[PDB]
Amino acid sequence: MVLYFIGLGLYDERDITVKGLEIAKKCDYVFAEFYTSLMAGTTLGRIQKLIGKEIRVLSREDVELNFENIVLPLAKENDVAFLTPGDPLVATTHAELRIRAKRAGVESYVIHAPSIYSAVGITGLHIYKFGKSATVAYPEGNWFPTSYYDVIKENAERGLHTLLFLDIKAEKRMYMTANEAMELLLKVEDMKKGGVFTDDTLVVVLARAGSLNPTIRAGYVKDLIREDFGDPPHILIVPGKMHIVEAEYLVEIAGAPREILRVNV
């Protein structure tokens, strides 16, 4: 009579922790969602084989509206697991689901897994220097989201890096690329003209973290805006004031122009 929130990790089914695997293998019922992120290197079938269980995939509606009707009822008489990409509580609203579990008298536990939030470390940028985070959302109809632009501005002013989560529309199999993110940003820049994101802005792209060969690229928007970074998922990062070893890493590892080695202090 327990509910387990278990992260599956960044790229494939092997990104789950041993703890998460062993516990999942022994749960009576296994549920999962694949709309909060994209695990590019695996399939539902492969996950099921590893875990040795049939997995009922839930939609955003099933979860956000009927979690307490579809999942919780079972966790009252069985060991239930709810799997998610990356870490179940990072950049999702799944934390609120623990409140529902409690109000239903269902104890819940959380098994973490590698998350894109900490994986940014592979970019060479000191993780403690990241400021507020944001999401570049797809414009819809006449509505054009722009808040993520202000986040970059605020962080840049303090010299902090900015992690930009990119939009996703799983049901339509749409995964925003870093290129689309850059195009949207230049459009916002054209509107606000704050000198926040231009063709000369240095950016970093991390694609398919978790795989053995993720794409890690750094450079100016003008050079990267049309570059192919491979299949999604992707994240875009706007560095703040860099330390010398950060720039050196971006150059030696992310193929950035040696030009950035000459850091301004």
Ligand X SMILES: Nc1ncnc2c1ncn2[C@@H]1O[C@H](CSCC[C@H](N)C(=O)O)[C@@H](O)[C@H]1O
Please report, as ranges, the residues that interact with its own copies according to CB under 8 A. 7, 9-10, 12-19, 21-22, 50, 86-96, 98-99, 102-103, 109-115, 117-119, 121-122, 124, 126-135, 154, 158, 160, 165, 209-210, 212-213, 245-246, 248-249, 252-253
CA dihedral 181, 187, 192, 197 (to 10 degrees): 50
Q: Give the Cα separation of 29 and 142 in Å (integer).
A: 43
165 touches Na ion by CB under 5 A? no
Stretch that binds ligand X, among 183-191, 194-202, 206-214, 222-230 (CB under 6 A): 206-214
CA dihedral 112, 115, 118, 124 (to 10 degrees): 140
Measured in whole angstroms, the distance separating CA 83 from the mean position of its chain's CA atoms is 15
- How many chain residues touch ligand X (CB under 6 A)? 25
Residues 6+ apart with CB under 8 A from 220: 199, 200, 201, 202, 203, 257
Stretch that binds ligand X, among 42-50, 55-63, 86-94, 220-228 (CB under 6 A): 86-94
**Nearer CB in complex with ligand X: 6/221:** 6
Closest CA to 27 of 58, 51, 62: 51
What is the 8-class DSSP label of residue 115?
-
The footprint of ligand X (CB under 6 A) covers 10-11, 36-37, 85-87, 90-92, 115-118, 165-166, 168, 206-210, 233-235
Residues placed in the known binding site for S-adenosyl-L-methionine:
10, 87, 90, 115-116, 166, 209, 234
